């Protein structure tokens, strides 16, 4: 209570003293400034040249209090800008914090986990540096227990959060050898009862799946897709969000990888996802659907069997534009690879009207994506001879009148398909 509101100069004065206690008091004061909720004087702490002195206190084993005070202190300094996080790493904090992971005091080792989390969370460079210092083995060792429930709640949460940061960022992506080293424990954290652990766990996965098919594969081969589909139907939005992102990334890969999420029973959840109150959930859901309709024909059939086509029509009809744009993509991929019988069913569900009303939108790309679909539908109509019957349906919903305007559009690729449609069919 007597270390509240110290001046930065006072903190340096006590730390520069030859008295261990005086240093401890000043260090605790420095922390209380950083933990003051309104704009802490980080830059001033750095320009004072204290960081190096804080890092050296992390080594004082005999005095565990100052270890905690300094770990806490540096943690907040590392939570700032990349320039401020760089200062902590420059002070030689990485190897010091990794040493604290073996500390007998859980509350101290938790700070090391917290700190290293901020450092790796900065970017790929520091992420890889934390890994090169050998921070993974210690971290994973802290979770080497029969049951995770016995571990402290907050302690388990921060550990998970730190691990998710070591799987974060893309350019470059985390070392393959490091990802394999963490996955097994990540799959274990993906079955824990705590929601915050499941959330961060799903985010960790969503990071790994984000990339080439080789990255997606090593995650799929761990057999987590089923667990993700289970989490995909959770009540907590914070949990469903990353789960949907993960599944959304897995379906961007091979059709075999895409088939795994179908076998898991993911499509049975989309009736809720495609009508989910939150707008972004619909956008992510529809985006995932577009990567499924772009697969095989038997895969497109799965979507038809689950009666998800009507939902795509509803989302194409009334939703946030961003979501409606994803809907257009879903239809386009659906009409390009789907059979005639499939495209027919799509039309009888009432896809035309809502697909024509989106031609009024002022987005250059969606128009291309739509017109492309229209061409694909006619492409099937010719195989039935009912190109005339289709033209009429488009004409009765003020569709032709809008294609007439796109026939004279600025973008070159637009008027190409438009004029080609007016001429060939109308």
């Amino acid at each position: 209570q007597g270390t509240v509101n110290w001046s930065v100069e006072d903190i340096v004065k006590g730390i520069n003293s030859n008295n261990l206690e005086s240093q401890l008091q000043a260090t605790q004061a420095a922390r209380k400034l950083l933990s003051r909720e309104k704009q802490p004087p980080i830059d001033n702490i750095i320009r004072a040249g204290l960081i190096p002195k804080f890092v050296s206190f992390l080594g004082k084993t005999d005095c565990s209090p100052i270890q905690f005070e300094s770990a806490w202190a540096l943690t907040n300094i590392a939570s700032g800008t990349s320039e401020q996080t760089k200062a902590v790493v420059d002070g030689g904090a990485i190897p010091a914090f990794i040493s604290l992971l073996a500390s007998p005091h859980a509350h101290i080792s938790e700070q090391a986990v917290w700190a290293l989390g901020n450092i790796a969370g900065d970017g790929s460079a520091f992420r890889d540096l934390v890994i090169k210092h050998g921070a993974i083995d210690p971290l994973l060792a802290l979770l080497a227990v029969p049951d995770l429930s016995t571990l402290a709640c907050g302690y388990l949460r921060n550990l998970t959060w730190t691990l998710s940061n070591l799987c974060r960022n893309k350019n470059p992506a985390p070392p393959l050898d490091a990802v394999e080293q963490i996955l097994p424990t990540l799959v274990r954290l993906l079955h824990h009862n705590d929601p915050e652990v499941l959330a961060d766990s799903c985010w960790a996965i969503s990071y790994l799946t984000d990339g080439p098919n080789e990255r997606i594969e090593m995650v799929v081969k761990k057999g987590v897709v089923p667990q993700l589909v289970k989490l995909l139907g959770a009540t907590e939005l914070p949990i469903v969000t990353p789960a949907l992102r993960a599944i959304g990334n897995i379906v961007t890969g091979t059709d075999e990888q895409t088939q795994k999420v179908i076998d898991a029973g993911a499509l049975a959840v989309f009736p809720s996802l495609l009508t989910n109150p939150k707008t972004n959930i619909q956008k992510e859901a529809t985006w995932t659907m577009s990567n499924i309709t772009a697969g095989r024909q038997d895969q497109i059939q799965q979507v038809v069997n689950h009666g998800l086509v009507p939902f795509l029509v509803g989302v194409l009809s009334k939703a946030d534009f961003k979501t409606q744009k994803e809907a257009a993509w879903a239809i386009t991929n659906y009409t390009s690879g789907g059979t005639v019988e499939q495209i027919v069913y799509l039309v009888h569900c009432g896809i035309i009207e809502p697909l024509m009303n989106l031609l009024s939108a002022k987005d250059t790309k969606i128009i291309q994506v739509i017109l492309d679909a229209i061409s694909n539908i006619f492409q099937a109509a010719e195989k039935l001879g009912e190109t005339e019957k289709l033209s009429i349906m488009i004409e009765e919903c003020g569709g032709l009148d809008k294609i007439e305007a796109l026939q004279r559009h600025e973008n070159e690729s637009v008027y190409k398909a438009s004029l080609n449609l007016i001429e060939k069919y109308f």
């Binding site: 933990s35 939570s79 901020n118 969370g121 992102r245």
Partner: peptide
């Protein structure tokens, strides 16, 4: 793209 990649421990 999810949660903040940096946490400051500033309790009350």
């Amino acid at each position: 793209e999810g949660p903040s990649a940096k946490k400051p421990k500033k309790e009350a």
